[PDB]
Amino acid sequence: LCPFGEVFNATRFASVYAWNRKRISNCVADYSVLYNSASFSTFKCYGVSPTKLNDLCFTNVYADSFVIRGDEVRQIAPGQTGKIADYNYKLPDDFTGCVIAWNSNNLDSKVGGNYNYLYRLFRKSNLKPFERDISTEIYQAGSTPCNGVEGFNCYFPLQSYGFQPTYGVGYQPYRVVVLSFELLHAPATVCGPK
Amino acid sequence: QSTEDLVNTFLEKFNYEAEELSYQSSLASWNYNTNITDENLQKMNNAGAKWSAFYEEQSKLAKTYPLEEIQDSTVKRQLRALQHSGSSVLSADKNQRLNTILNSMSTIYSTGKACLLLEPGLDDIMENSKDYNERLWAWEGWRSEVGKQLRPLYEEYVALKNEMARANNYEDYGDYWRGDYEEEWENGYNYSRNQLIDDVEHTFTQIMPLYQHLHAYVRTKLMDTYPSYISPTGCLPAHLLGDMWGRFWTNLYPLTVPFGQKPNIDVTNAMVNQSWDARKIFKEAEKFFVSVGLPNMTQGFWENSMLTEPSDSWKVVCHPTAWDLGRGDFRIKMCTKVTMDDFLTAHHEMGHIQYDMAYAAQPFLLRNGANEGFHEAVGEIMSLSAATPNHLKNIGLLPPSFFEDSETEINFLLKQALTIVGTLPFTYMLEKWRWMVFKGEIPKDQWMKTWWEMKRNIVGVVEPVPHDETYCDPASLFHVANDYSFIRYYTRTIYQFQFQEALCQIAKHEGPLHKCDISNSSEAGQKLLEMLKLGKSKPWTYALEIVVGAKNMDVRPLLNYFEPLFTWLKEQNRNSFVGWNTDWSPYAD
Ligand SMILES: *[C@@H]1O[C@H](CO)[C@@H](O[C@@H]2O[C@H](CO)[C@@H](O)[C@H](O)[C@H]2NC(C)=O)[C@H](O)[C@H]1NC(C)=O
Ligand SMILES: *[C@@H]1O[C@H](CO)[C@@H](O[C@@H]2O[C@H](CO)[C@@H](O)[C@H](O)[C@H]2NC(C)=O)[C@H](O)[C@H]1NC(C)=O
Ligand SMILES: *[C@@H]1O[C@H](CO)[C@@H](O[C@@H]2O[C@H](CO)[C@@H](O)[C@H](O)[C@H]2NC(C)=O)[C@H](O)[C@H]1NC(C)=O
Ligand SMILES: *[C@@H]1O[C@H](CO)[C@@H](O[C@@H]2O[C@H](CO)[C@@H](O)[C@H](O)[C@H]2NC(C)=O)[C@H](O)[C@H]1NC(C)=O
Ligand SMILES: *[C@@H]1O[C@H](CO)[C@@H](O)[C@H](O)[C@H]1NC(C)=O
Ligand SMILES: [Zn+2]
């Protein structure tokens, strides 16, 4: 009987680049309370339908929770391209799991400008599936490198969203949680009756 | 490693670092206009200074990239927009002097005093008073007091502006202004600056006949007030033009009305009967804009916008404006009332808001109009289409038994003509004088002797009192005392009718053009949003050709709009003389 609730309604969510990982094992699964939330803008489950959840269950489940914009929600999907889908968080082509997002403008805004959420816009190459990098090295653009400190033709690789209450709809903050399964040799434990 | 590679990275940082410093300045400016206090001014000034400093730093540091190697089309023009800005870099010592001169030149106009300040009392005499003597002294006095102190300051202004223009490999300061229409493309969509002088000089000949007729009636309808004071074959004096300088003729309507027994189309009483309010007006405007296939208004529009007088004793200006603060923020600010006049402004501002929403997907540097006239021209056709009898009857504010009379149409056409057609010779003359002066061809010692020489020859307005070279007439205008382009209106006037003819043709309306309507048509709006979404990503020749199908301005649509008025007026000139003579003087008969 693992508490799926606290994963969703947690106090603070992390930046996109430092995407948190939660591991859940040796418990039961309760998907009714997630379905009856009535506050999910996107509920796209890929390879997931409540019809056949009662015959096959998995061993361990991983959860990822972060905060993104409103127009970047469509980029959390297999094969999508853009900025967040190749520099921050990529879903493998053979992905079996669920993505849930909801609006959370009422909690993460300030009239003076919230500056505690960051995203990365430059890199040397695309990120491998389920790969992370929190490197603070100054990104290099030109052929000639700069001596560890930026200025001309050198750029810091992180930029912050200035969330404010009176933005549009595609710029309002959104909270996203992704659930994925694993099929290793551990005993299949996460599945419940009724 | 190519130059394009560095350019792309440099631009992708700017596109996001400008969006905050613009938003902060927009919010600071909006809060002051909304609340007006003694403390918001400092915040607004700080935000503006920060944004200006950031822009000036980026524009200077972006000049190390040569333009010759750029291959992509839009990427080159983004840097063209970024680099040309900040061209006012000639000398640090001279910059302070120029700024002080500009501020001093602007100061006297703001603090002008004449026995009554310009806005409260001085405007009323020129706009409503019908006394000959009262205007006769006032028109001279306004130039004598305020103007004479502005003449010596304006001498160095033209020289400094010419030096600034020559700094950037231009010819004269006029050519610097003429660069808002210059574009470079393939053989079919290229525009050169020196053609703009010629094209306008064409589009004024074809309007020459009609204007002449408009010069006749009024001349024979102003005879009654002054029987033996002005000659019946000469130029109209300036002080009897219904305005201080003569920009609009719209206040001569009570003096020259053909049929005063038929009231104009007014629905204010019907609105009063049904107890309308601001929200009803704006919902009606939203219905009008959504019926033509355009999208609707976002949720925050009704919550963040100010749409009425604040009656809590706080001071506001609330001059009608529409704001696109940035990043999904759209607001409209206007003191709403319960008269018919605000019904047109409701559509006029919504047009600007829709045009702003259209191009939000373009990069930051491309979020504007095609040129300096498209943005305002888009919002006039909505007011034109929302003031027709058919729309008023369809909405419900008008009884179904109402009919249309020929005299009503003639009076409406004359009322619109006195506002639109009468402002074209003045607008053309002012720009012609300024361009010639900036070129320096006109001798400095005969400026007045040249200026009035134009007035008789082009617009046919004669001064009441002879003047020497001490005076400086053009400085009397607000747009001249401050550095501002004056050629926008000439283009906008033609563009609005150019668009209206095509849209009405696509809507398949049968009858004369002035009785058109574009409601209940999802095709015209769909075609319009095809160009509105472009923004500045393509030159304005493509934007024009997408809708009308041509590449240059044509004044034929404007002549087709006023065909009934022209034909009906043509009969009244048979027992009259049309034209003016440059032979009469105020001092000698
Ligand atoms: C996460 O925490 C919130 C805390 O408010 C839970 O919200 C409650 O939802 C139930 C219905 O599911 C209501 O009856 C309660 O009144 C709500 N608030 C309270 C006081 O708990 C939410 O249900 C939790 N998450 C999940 C998935 O159950
Ligand atoms: C747009 O490009 C055309 C290209 O042909 C320019 O046409 C020039 O016209 C002059 C005058 O006859 C010729 O001497 C040139 O040889 C033509 N070609 C070029 C490349 O200059 C035209 O002047 C350009 N500008 C406009 C406003 O049409
Ligand atoms: C709105 O228009 C109606 C049109 O009839 C007005 O109605 C009459 O008003 C007078 C008083 O002003 C009453 O004595 C009559 O009985 C009303 N009805 C009729 C049939 O004449 C009405 O007053 C106007 N104003 C409002 C706000 O209702
Ligand atoms: C634009 O947004 C408005 C709401 O701001 C939409 O209006 C609603 O449309 C639905 C259509 O079924 C009606 O049931 C509602 O009563 C309307 N009003 C409200 C207050 O919700 C409008 O339809 C949207 N766009 C269009 C196509 O006009
Ligand atoms: C504007 O500022 C004053 C002073 O702080 C405040 O009382 C008022 O509520 C604000 N807003 C309005 C609607 O005037
Ligand atoms: Zn406008």
Numbering used by the authors:
A (entry chain B): 335 to 528
B (entry chain A): 19 to 133, 142 to 615
The authors write:
The receptor binding domain (RBD) of the spike (S) protein binds to its host receptor, angiotensin-converting enzyme 2 (ACE2), facilitating virus entry. In our study, we investigated the binding affinities of raccoon dog ACE2 (rdACE2) to the spike (S) protein receptor binding domain (RBD) of SARS-CoV-2 prototype (PT) and its variants. To elucidate the molecular basis of rdACE2 binding to SARS-CoV-2 PT and Alpha RBDs, respectively, we obtained cryo-EM rdACE2/S complex structures. The cryo-EM structures of rdACE2 bound to SARS-CoV-2 PT or Alpha S proteins were determined at 2.52 Å and 2.86 Å, respectively.
To obtain a high-resolution view of the RBD/ACE2 interface, local refinement was performed, resulting in the determination of the PT RBD/rdACE2 and Alpha S RBD/rdACE2 structures at 2.64 Å and 3.16 Å, respectively. Similarly, in the Alpha S/rdACE2 complex, two RBDs were present, but only one up-RBD was observed to bind to rdACE2. As previously reported, the interacting residues of the RBD can be divided into two patches. In patch 1 of both PT and Alpha RBD, S477 and N487 form hydrogen bonds (H-bonds) with Q18 and Y83, respectively. K417 of RBD forms a salt bridge with E30 of rdACE2. In PT RBD, Q493 in patch 1 binds to Y34 of the rdACE2, whereas in Alpha RBD, Q493 forms an H-bond contact with E35. Moving to patch 2, T500 and N501 of both PT and Alpha RBD form H-bonds with Y41 of rdACE2, while G502 of these two RBDs forms an H-bond with R353 of rdACE2. Furthermore, in PT RBD, Y449 forms an H-bond contact with E38 and Q42 of rdACE2. Conversely, in Alpha RBD, Y449 forms an additional H-bond with R353 of rdACE2. The results indicate that PT, Alpha and Delta variants exhibit comparable binding affinities to rdACE2.
